[PDB]
Structures are given as C-alpha cells and as structure tokens.
Design a binder for these strands. Structure first.
Ligand code: NA
Ligand code: NA
Length: 327
DNA sequence: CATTAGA
DNA sequence: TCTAATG
C-alpha cells in the first residue's frame, strides 16, 4: 500500500505505456499482474532477486526493479516521459471519442494538438467533434450543488412524461459525494422487464423531453436502452452560463433495477465486499440479479427484489445508507 | 462486460 | 462484419 508504492507506480506507468503507445497487450498485461502481486507483498522489496521470487515477475521486471531501487529513477521511464510522440498520444486521448487507436493514427498524421485537432475537425467523427468542442467542460468536476440542480431537473421531466417512470441518479453523487465526474441516471418502467420485449420509445420519450427543454443539448450515443449525451443547466439571468456536462441515461427492466442501482451506486469496494458476503450467505450478486447458491458448485434462480433492502435482507446484512456504501 | 458507432 | 470507445 506504500511499502511498495514506487515499484508499483513505475510498474503501472511502464505498463500503461506499452498499452497506449505501443500496441503490446502482452507486456502490457505483464506489467499489471506484476504490479498486482508486488502490491500485495507484505514487505519492502529490497531487490530484483527478491522481487523475482514472485509470480508474474520475470527477469525483465526484476531488472527494472533494480535500477529503480538503486537510482531514484529509470531510464526507459525517463526516455518515454520525454518523447514527444508518446506524450502526444496520452494527450489526444483526453478527448472524448479519442482513444489509443485514433490517437496513434492522428499523431502519425501530425495532429499532435488541440489546435491541430481543430484545424482538422473534418477528420473527426461526431463523438470526437463534441469531445473537442467541450474539451474544457469535460474535464471539469461536477459540484454536488450543481448535481442537485440537475437531478431536480430530470426527475421533473421523467415524471411529467410518464408517472410510472422510476429514475435514480447513481454514483458518488448518490453516495453523498461533494463533486462528481458525470451524471448517471438509472431508468425504469413497470411495463418493461426481462421478457416484455422492449419498448424503445420507453427511453426515447424522455430523451426527447429532456431535449425539448434544453437540458440535453447533445447526443453522443443514443440506442434503445443506453443514451449517452450532453446536458446543461440553464444559464440564469446572465453573467454566468453553465459548463457543458456528460450524461448517461439507461433503460432498465423493472425486474432488475435495484440490482442495477445497487451496483452502479458502488463504491468499487463496497461492491465486491457486499459481493463477497452473498457467497458466504449462500448467494451470487452481479449487475442484474441475485441467485441462490447451489452446493453442486453452481446454481441459478433469480430471487425477486423490490428495493435495495431485499438484496440486503437476502444476504441478511445491515441496510447501508448509500452515504455509507463507501467500502 | 455490454452497448453503440462506423466504415 | 470488426473494431473502437465509454462506461
Ligand atoms: Na517467479
Ligand atoms: Na478520450
């Protein structure tokens, strides 16, 4: 957790590198497992040889561990950190819609920067166009004070469209959090479940409501169940307009909502931890359901849930406020 | 780990 | 269809 901190960071760094810049999944997975195991190891690694004793730790990684052990740095690390091309990629990549593949392709063409990008909008597809367009707004956190303003907006349309809708803003937002990355709205309707073969307008009506009042201003990806776009609070009585925010609205089979909402609500640790518990308490949990665990090894059969409670009761735990779903 | 775009 | 990208 700190006793191995550098070896781990160098490692993640290293790793990250083969992945983006080069296309070396292997080496790249190589670093992460290594990174994974040393992170655990209960002692201060004093040498490559010692490290080497671990699993996932080959000769190649030990070597690097020495140099970093000996001199507060690593050459290769130094070299990459420097190198413009590689730097360009980790950079382009910050654009929503840009990832390793397009990043290298752009660079190999010469677009290394934000400007370049603009000069070449035509070489960019609508997602990226927008990523570019709101590049600034996209990196800016979401003040909770703002979230509450938003949510207040969405719940209101949802309801006005159909009283039957059920929406829940998930995430850290939900877990009390001060700021937030982007808004996650979990959506559902009675008339829609595991079987009841869709109702695409079900999603589409809201998306359309939301736009009709200008909360959504853009569409990244709209499909029959997941809609990925952009929204913005009204810029009041001018002098101050609100930055553009990322929003994801998703349709849910009313019969799997709470597993959904339980889940997206995180945290990542609370999950696994709750998840690790159902297992003792003879179960299984995942994004949509909760099935009783059969001794033959496995076993099916989706218990029925009507609230985040059911799930608790089921595995028989303490109802944990989202607030405290921290770990 | 699954959903959408794109070409 | 494959492949990329966000989640
Ligand atoms: Na070994
Ligand atoms: Na990106």
């Amino acid at each position: 957790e700190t006793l191995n901190g550098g070896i781990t960071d160098m490692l993640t760094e290293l790793a990250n590198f083969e992945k983006n810049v080069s296309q070396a999944i292997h080496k790249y997975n190589a670093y992460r497992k290594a990174a994974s195991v040393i992170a655990k190891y209960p002692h201060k690694i004093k040498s490559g040889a010692e490290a080497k004793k671990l699993p996932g730790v080959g000769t190649k990684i030990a070597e690097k561990i020495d140099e970093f052990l000996a001199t507060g740095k690593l050459r290769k690390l130094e070299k990459i950190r420097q190198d413009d091309t590689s730097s360009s990629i980790n950079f382009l990549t910050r654009v929503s819609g840009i990832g390793p593949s397009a990043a290298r392709k752009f660079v190999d063409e010469g677009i290394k920067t934000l400007e370049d990008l603009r000069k070449n909008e035509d070489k960019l597809n609508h997602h990226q166009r927008i990523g570019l367009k709101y590049f600034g707004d996209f990196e800016k956190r979401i003040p909770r004070e703002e979230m509450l303003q938003m949510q207040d907006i969405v719940l209101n349309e949802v309801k006005k469209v159909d009283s039957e809708y059920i929406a829940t803003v998930c995430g850290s937002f939900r877990r009390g959090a001060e700021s937030s990355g982007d808004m996650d709205v979990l959506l559902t309707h009675p008339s829609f479940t595991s079987e009841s073969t869709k109702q695409p307008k079900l999603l589409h009506q809201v998306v359309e409501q939301l736009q009709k009042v200008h909360f959504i201003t853009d569409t990244l990806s709209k499909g029959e169940t997941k809609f990925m776009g952009v929204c913005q609070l009204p810029s009041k009585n001018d002098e101050k307009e609100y930055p553009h925010r990322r929003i994801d609205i998703r349709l849910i089979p009313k019969d799997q909502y709470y597993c959904g909402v339980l889940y997206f609500t995180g945290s990542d640790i609370f999950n696994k931890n709750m998840r690790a518990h159902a297992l003792e308490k003879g179960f299984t949990i995942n994004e949509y359901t909760i099935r009783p665990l059969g001794v033959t090894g496995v076993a099916g059969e989706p218990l029925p849930v009507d609230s985040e409670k059911d799930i608790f009761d089921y595995i028989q735990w303490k109802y944990r406020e989202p607030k405290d779903r921290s770990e």
